[PDB]
Amino acid sequence: SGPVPSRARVYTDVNTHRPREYWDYESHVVEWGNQDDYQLVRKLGRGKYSEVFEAINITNNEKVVVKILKPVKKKKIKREIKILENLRGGPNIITLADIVKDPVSRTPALVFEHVNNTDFKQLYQTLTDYDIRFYMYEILKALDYCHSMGIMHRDVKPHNVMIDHEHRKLRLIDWGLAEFYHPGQEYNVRVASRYFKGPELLVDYQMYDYSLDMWSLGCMLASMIFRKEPFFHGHDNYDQLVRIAKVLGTEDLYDYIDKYNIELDPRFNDILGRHSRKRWERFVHSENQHLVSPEALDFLDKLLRYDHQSRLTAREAMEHPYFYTVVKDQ
Ligand SMILES: Cc1cnc(Cl)c2c1[nH]c1ccc3cc(O)ccc3c12
């Protein structure tokens, strides 16, 4: 057999000890609420699998968000519902408030708590150094919680982090790509958005884990402190790896793939080239230098590693000196 196997270094056996029904989402029996409780007000967006609306709950008069599914890959339906139910109440995880049958589409409609957020292209230009540290800690709370519950998000991106800046409140949304981690399981590499895909995805390595989410958060951090959106700006999936290699170097890339006995797609032969690892100071200039510190760079350096096993875990990340200046609640 070809590729060397891999395991999460934390929360490894979390699912294997749980009752079968916790992770066996296929068997879950959906509890339906009352569709007439809700009234659609404004369409907020169309995803790949769904349509999203601001609504209002008529029974309590409170604002709500309704995601109406478009079932073509029907398995993801029971998977997402079970994941949000398992995670409900956790820190900075969006609350699934109800599940109703939509009379028009005839499909499930997830009803979430309302969060009033601002556009990230507008918001990621405003964040002071202090505020980057604050919100990063808040994200980590969300990620450690779901990782501890045996769940990987697999789509961390600025779009999926809803932020109420006036109230300094944060929520991690869109659990449509989320999955239960089972040691030794082979996963689909076709997940996450292009700029936020970890090296494991890009080299076709299927036995990945929670550490996928940490590469992603790494990409977000780099874009914030350096003011460069996105940080790794690929034309496509292949060039995306080339973009990573121009920063982290090709020798460490070859070391990664060699450790796991993986073969790069031969398409890379004529496009990858030879690149040294860059020092993080090369991305610093007079416009972003107020967002950068020794601690910020060390922290970043420990998130953005090729080897998914060498990345900081969420809990270790919360232990980093980067977070010392941040006041905790309470
Ligand atoms: C594409 C997509 C998928 N899933 C969710 Cl929950 C959302 C989404 N877009 C939005 C936009 C605003 C939202 C506000 C919420 O309070 C909760 C979820 C969303 C969502």
* Displacement of CA 32 from its chain's centroid (Å): 28
Using CB atoms within 10 Å of the CB of residue 85, give its burial: 0 to 12 exposed, 13 to 18 middle, 19+ buried: middle
210 closest CA partner among 198, 227, 225, 224: 198
Q: Is the beta carbon of 54 within 6 A of some atom in ligand 1?
A: no
The alpha carbon torsion through 248, 249, 253, 255 (nearest 10 deg) reads -110
Most informative mutation of 64, 81, 112 for ligand 1 (most atoms within 8 A of CB): 112
Residues 6+ apart with CB under 8 A from 308: 6, 198, 199, 200, 208, 209, 211, 212, 215
Q: Is the beta carbon of 115 within 6 A of some atom in ligand 1?
A: yes
Q: How far is the CA of 42 from the centre of ligand 1 (A)?
A: 13
How far is Cα 15 from Cα 2, in angstroms, rounded to an integer?
27
- 278 among the known binding-site residues? no
How far from each other are the two terminal CA atoms of the chain, in whole angstroms?
Answer: 52
Q: Is the beta carbon of 280 within 6 A of some atom in ligand 1?
A: no
Residues 96/112, Cβ–Cβ less than 8 Å: yes
Token reading at 38: 């809700």
Looking at residue 303, its amino acid is L
How far is Cα 175 from Cα 74, in angstroms, rounded to an integer?
15
Q: Is the beta carbon of 65 within 6 A of some atom in ligand 1?
A: yes
Q: Is the beta carbon of 189 within 6 A of some atom in ligand 1?
A: no
Q: What phi, psi does 139 have (nearest 5°)?
A: -65, -40
How far is Cα 193 from Cα 171, in angstroms, rounded to an integer?
19
Q: How far is the CA of 94 from the centre of ligand 1 (A)?
A: 9
User: Is the bond leading into 108 cis (omega within 30 degrees of zero)?
Assistant: no
Sign of CA dihedral 190, 193, 195, 199: negative
How far is Cα 215 from Cα 210, in angstroms, rounded to an integer?
10
Q: What phi, psi does 41 have (nearest 5°)?
A: -115, -45
Q: How far is the CA of 135 from the centre of ligand 1 (A)?
A: 18
CB atoms closer than 10 angstroms to residue 103: 9
Please identify every residue annotated as catalytic. Answer: 155
CA 12, 18, 20: angle at the middle one, nearest 5?
A: 120
Nearest CA to ligand 1 atom 10: 52
Resolution in A: 2.1
Looking at residue 53, its amino acid is F
Sign of CA dihedral 248, 249, 252, 256: positive
Nearest CA to ligand 1 atom 14: 115
Residues 35/100, Cβ–Cβ less than 8 Å: yes
Q: How far is the CA of 205 from the centre of ligand 1 (A)?
A: 30
Most informative mutation of 38, 52, 70 for ligand 1 (most atoms within 8 A of CB): 52
Q: Can you give the chain as a three-state secondary structure string?
A: CCCCCCCCCCCCCHHHHCCHHHHCHHHCCCCCCCHHHEEEEEEEEECCCEEEEEEEECCCCCEEEEEEECCCCCHHHHHHHHHHHHHCCCCCECCEEEEEECCCCCCEEEEEECCCCCCHHHHCCCCCHHHHHHHHHHHHHHHHHHHHCCEECCCCCHHHEEEECCCCEEEECCCCCCEECCCCCCCCCCCCCHHHCCHHHHCCCCCCCCHHHHHHHHHHHHHHHHCCCCCCCCCCHHHHHHHHHHHHCHHHHHHHHHHCCCCCCHHHHHCCCCCCCCCHHHHCCCCCHHHCCHHHHHHHHHHCCCCHHHCCCHHHHHCCHHHCCCCCCC
* Method used to determine the 3D structure: X-ray
Residues 6+ apart with CB under 8 A from 199: 215, 241, 244, 253, 256, 306, 308
Sign of CA dihedral 49, 189, 216, 234: negative
Token reading at 128: 């002071």
Residues 133/322, Cβ–Cβ less than 8 Å: yes
All CATH 3.30.200.20 domain ranges of the chain, comma separated, are 24-114
Count Cα neighbours of 65 within 13 Å in the Cβ-side half-sphere. Answer: 19
CB atoms closer than 10 angstroms to residue 203: 20
Q: Is the beta carbon of 174 within 6 A of some atom in ligand 1?
A: yes
Q: How far is the CA of 69 from the centre of ligand 1 (A)?
A: 12
Residues 149/179, Cβ–Cβ less than 8 Å: no
Q: What phi, psi does 280 have (nearest 5°)?
A: -60, -25
Most informative mutation of 42, 67, 68 for ligand 1 (most atoms within 8 A of CB): 67
Residues 6+ apart with CB under 8 A from 310: none
- 45 - beta bridge partners? 52
All CATH 1.10.510.10 domain ranges of the chain, comma separated, are 6-23+115-330
Residues 62/56, Cβ–Cβ less than 8 Å: yes
Token reading at 63: 């604002």
Token reading at 176: 């449509």
Residues 6+ apart with CB under 8 A from 50: 67, 68, 69, 70, 176
* Displacement of CA 254 from its chain's centroid (Å): 26
132 closest CA partner among 264, 225, 38: 225
Residues 123/191, Cβ–Cβ less than 8 Å: no
Q: What is the CATH number of domain 6-23+115-330?
A: 1.10.510.10
Place of tokens 């959106």: 229
Nearest CA to ligand 1 atom 7: 174
Q: Are strands 50-57 and 63-69 parallel, antiparallel or unpaired?
A: antiparallel
Q: Is the beta carbon of 79 within 6 A of some atom in ligand 1?
A: no
CATH 3.10.690.10 is the classification of domain 24-114:
no
